[model samples]
Target: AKIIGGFAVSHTPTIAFAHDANKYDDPVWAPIFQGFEPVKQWLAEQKPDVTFYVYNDHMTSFFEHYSHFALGVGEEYSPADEGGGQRDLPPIKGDPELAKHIAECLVADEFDLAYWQGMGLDHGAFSPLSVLLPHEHGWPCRIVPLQCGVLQHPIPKARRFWNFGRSLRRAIQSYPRDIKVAIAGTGGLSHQVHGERAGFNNTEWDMEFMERLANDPESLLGATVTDLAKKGGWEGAEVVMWLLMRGALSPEVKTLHQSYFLPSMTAIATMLFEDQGDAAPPAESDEALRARAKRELAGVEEIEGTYPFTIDRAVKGFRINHFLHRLIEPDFRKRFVEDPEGLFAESDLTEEEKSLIRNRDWIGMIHYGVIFFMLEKMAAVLGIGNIDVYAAFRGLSVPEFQKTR
Candidate 1:
C-alpha cells in the first residue's frame, strides 16, 4: 500500500485572522506563521500525488436554509463569497478520480455527504492549507477537499465519523494513484467564536483530548459536545475535527507529533498520526464492518483502555463555566480579552481533571469542557508555548519522538 502523509492545524489562527486582521502581527502571534515553515518543507518534500483535506464550513457559502456536508470533485476550486471577502490564499485544484471515489464510497456507505463539483475554499479548508501548502503562486499537488457541516445538528455522529475514517482508509488504499496521498484534518482543540457563550477555552481538556484521540478514540465517540463543554468550554464542540483525522487513519496508529498553544484567544493545537498496520481490507465485506462495529461497541459500559471522559459530568461544568463568563456578559467576553479565568470558579472536577486544567493541558479536557479560548487563558496564566499541553499530558517535559511517516 502507498503511504499517505497526514497533517492538521488548529483552525483558530485562520479564524482569528479572518475575524480580525489587526492581530496578525501581534508579538504573541508571530510564532504561528513561523511554525508553518517546517510543514511547508514537508509537503514540498513529499510532493503527494493528491491531498485529501477534511475541513468544516463556517456558515460562509452555506447558510441556515441550505447547508451541506460535501467533498470537492471538480478540476479546480476558487475562493467564493463566505459573506465576507475571500481569504488570502489563491484558488485550489482538485483531483477528479480520487474525488469521485470518495463520493461513491460515502454514498455507498449510506452517508448524506454532499458532493460539490463547483465551489470555493472557506477558511475551514483554506486556512490550514494556506500554511501547510504555502505557495508563492499556487499549491503544488491536486486536492480533494472534504467539507463537513458543523453548524447544524444531526451532523454525523462520533461513531459514524470514525467509521467514515475507516472507510476513507479503504478508499485511499484502493486508489490506483502511483504517488503518495496526504490527509489533512483541520481545526480544533477548543475555542468558541460566537454566541452568548463566546470566548471559551480549556487547555486541560484539550491536551487530554488529543492524547486519547490517538490512543483511544472509541472512548471519545461516547463523548458529546456537552461533555467537551463541561471540561473545556462551550466552543469545545470543534473536537469533532479530531474524529475526521482519526477516521482517515487505521485503528492502531502512532502519534508523530502533537502540540497545544494559546497565543491570543484560540486553543492552538496540532496532531500527526501515522497508520502502523497494513491498509488492506480485513477479510470481511462491508456488511461485516457494520456488524463488527455494533458488536464491539455493544455491552461495553466504558471504553476498555479509555480514561473515562464522562459526558454528563463535563456538560455540567460547561454550563457553569459558560455561566461564569456570562456573568460579565459582553463585558465578560471583553474581560476574556484580558483575564480568561478571572471569572471562572474552581471547576467541579476531580483533582485529576482539575490538575489537567490547572496545568493548561488543553487536550486532556477534550473529555472535559476546555475550549480553545480558555486554553489561551490557561497558557497565558501558565506561561508556555503550543506544545505545552502534549508535554504535560504525556508526562514528557520535552518531545522524544521522531517525525516519521
Candidate 2:
C-alpha cells in the first residue's frame, strides 16, 4: 500500500444531522459547501482503495473505562446512533487484513492500541465521509477507524499522536497490497461545545495553527494539553487528532484546498494536502482558489440538480428511499404498480412525498434530498428509462435533453 494523500476536516455532529445539500444557496452555509466541493471532486478522481480515518469518540461507543486508542479490525461496521437512532445509510465496510497488519506493526513500534473486532462509527467518522462521497452505490473505499479519547483527560499527548502517524506510515508502506491509501484526520478548527464557554471560537489561532501544521508541524511537538486547551478552548484541543495526518505526510506538500467557515457554533474548516512530487501543482493562492470556486459553483443552485442523499437526508427520507430501494424486488414493484395509492399509503409516506410521486415531480424530489439513484430505482419500477428522469430534472422533453447530452 502507498500513502497517497491526506485530509483534515471538521467532524461536528450538526454537519451530519442537519446537512441539506440545497442549503448551498444560503449565504451562511454556501462557503462551506463551496469549500468541500473541490475536496469531494478530488476524492472521486483519486479513488483511493482505503482510508485510515482518525477521529475522537464523543463518549458514545468507547467509554472512559477503556483504553485511549481503539483500532477497529472488522470486516463491517454499523453506524452508532448516538441517541437519536441509526441512520439509513449502509454499514461502513472495513479492511481487516490491513487493520491486523497495522495493529502488529504499532505494537512492535511500542504503541499499544486497543484492538477491536466489532466497532460502530458515530458522526465523528461518518460526517466527513458523508461529504466525501455524497452519492454512491455504496462507499467506494474501505476504512480503518482509529478512535482517540479527546473527550476525557489522560489522553495521549499531541506529540505522541504525531509520532504514531510516523509509525503508521511505515506500517502502511510495508503492507503487501498494491493499493492507494489516504489518511484522514477529522476534527477541530477551534470551538467550545460545552461549559460556560460554550460558543467560544478563536479563528485567528485556528488559521495560525493550520499554517504551522502545513509548514512546520514539528514546532507544535512541544505543546502540552494545557497549552492547547488554553489557546483553543478545552473542546477545541481535540485538534490534536490532526497531527496524525500531518505527520504521516512529507514535509513538502502542495496545499490543494483550504477553507474556513464560522457560520455555526463551530468553526468548520477543511484542508487537503498532497505529497509534493506525486500531486498536482498548487495553481493559485487560497483566496484566489476560493474566488474561483465561487465562480465555478455560482449557478449550481439555479440548475435543478439532484440533492445528494446523505446520512442526514437518508434518515429524513428513510421511508421514501427505503421504499424506492426495495423496488428491485419484483413483488414490491408489482404491488406498487397494481395499487399505487394503496402501496404509497402502506409505505407511510408523507402527503408531500406522496404528491411528488403521484405527480412524477422528479426534480422536486431531487431538491427534497431524495438521491438520484433512488429515483432511478423508482423509475425502473415504473418502466421508465434513466433518460426520462434526466429530461424531467432538466425541464425538457427526452429529445431536448438528449440533444444537450
Candidate 3:
C-alpha cells in the first residue's frame, strides 16, 4: 500500500504556537517537546509525497447546520482563526487529485462524506502539522484533510473509523502514482474541555489506550460510547480518531517511538509506527470488483437501452431529483405549476437542470442522470402515466410502445 507509516499525536489548542526550539528546556513542557524531536527528524528523513491528516473541527470551521465526515478537496487551505485570529502562517497546499480519488473509493465502500472545496484548517490540522514541520516555507508535503465527526452526537464509531482506514489503504495503493503516503491521526490522549469535570485526566486509561492502539485495537472496540466518555472524559473520546491512522498500517507494526506527558489541561502524547512486513499491495477493493462487474455487463447497454442511476449519477442529479420528488406534496405541486421558473430560480439547481425540466425532454432528462422513478413522479404531476414515460424512453408513441410491450 502507499501508506509508508503513520503517526498518532495529541493536539491541545494551547500548543498551536509552541514550536519554539527552547520549549524543550522548560520544566513544565520539556518532555513533550523533547519527545517530538524524533518524530520531526523521521518526517524530514522520509518526506512522504502527501499526508492524510485526519482531524475534527472544534466548532470553528463547521457548525451544527450540517455536520459531516468531510474531506478537503481544495488546492489550498488557510489556517482558521478559531475566534482569536488567523494564525500568521502560510496556507497549506492540498492534494486534490488524491483527495477526490479517496472520496470516490469511500463512497463506493458505502461511506457518505461531504467534500469541502474551500475549507480552512483549524488547530485540529495545523497544530500537529506545525509540530512536525515548523517551517516558514509552509508544510513540507501536500496534505489531504480527512475530517471525522467528534463534537456532535452519533459521531463515527471507533470500528467504523478503523474500517474507513482499511478502505483508505486500498484507495491509496490503487492509485497509479508511485509515491509514499503518510497517515497522521491528531486529537486527544485523555482530557476534558468543559463542565465541572473540566481538566479531567486519566493516566491509566491513557497508557492503556496507547498499548491497545499499538498491539490490540480491537480489544477496545467493545467499549461503549458512555464508557469512553466516563473514562477518558467527553473530549478525550476523540482518541478514536487515532484508530484511523493505525488501521491504515499492517496489524504487525514496530513502535519506533512513543511518549506521553500530562502537563496541565490535556494529556499530550505521540507515537510513530512502521509496518513489520513488506509493503505488498492489498487485495482488490469492492469498488474495483464492482467496476469489473460493470465492464462485464457493458454488452447489456446495447440491448437494454436504459440508464442505470449509479451513486455518482445520483449525486450529480440530486437537485433535479429533489425538485421532482417534491411533486408528491400538494403545496409544492401548486407552486411548481403556478410559477415553475420562480420555483426553479429559488433552488440551487444549475442552468442545465432548469433546462432539463423546462423543455420536458424526458429522454434528455434520463441522459442528464435523472432517475426513472423521479421521471414518473414528474409525469404524474403533469397528468402523464407510466406508459407515456416508457414511450418517451423508447422514442415511440404511447400506442406503439404499448404494442411492443
For candidate 3, write residues 238-347 as lDDT tens digits: 88888888887787788999998888888889999885544554477545644643453457668656677544565557678878988888988887888898898888
Instruction: Please list the residue runs of candidate 2 whose C-alpha ends up more than 4 Å from where it truly belongs after superposition.
Output: 20-22, 277-405
Please report how far candidate 2 places residue 106 from its true position, in Å.
0.8
- Overall local distance difference test of candidate 3: 0.80
How many residue pairs of model 3 clash at the backbone? 0
Give the candidate order by descending TM-score: 3, 2, 1
Highest-lDDT candidate: 3
Return the clash pairs for model 3, or none: none
lDDT of each: 0.63, 0.78, 0.80
Candidate 1 TM-score over all chains jointly: 0.64
> lDDT per residue, candidate 2, 53-131, as tens digits?
9998777788846677788776677778788887667787887777866776677678977766445788898877877
Q: Which stretches of candidate 1 lie over 4 Å from their true place?
A: 1-3, 13-26, 64-68, 279-281, 284-405
Candidate 1, 1-405: lDDT as tens digits: 354557667765454463346454766656655555555667788778788887777677667544445766666787766666776666777776666555555565666765555567777776667666656698888888877776677566767777777777766665555668878877776777777767778787788888788888788887776676677665567567668767777776777766666765677777666666565656655444444434533565664424332222333345433443343346655544466455344334355654654455555664455554545544554366656655555556645522222
TM-scores of all predicted structures: 0.64, 0.67, 0.71
The CA lDDT at 341 in model 2 is: 82
Worst 10 residues of 2 by lDDT: 285-294
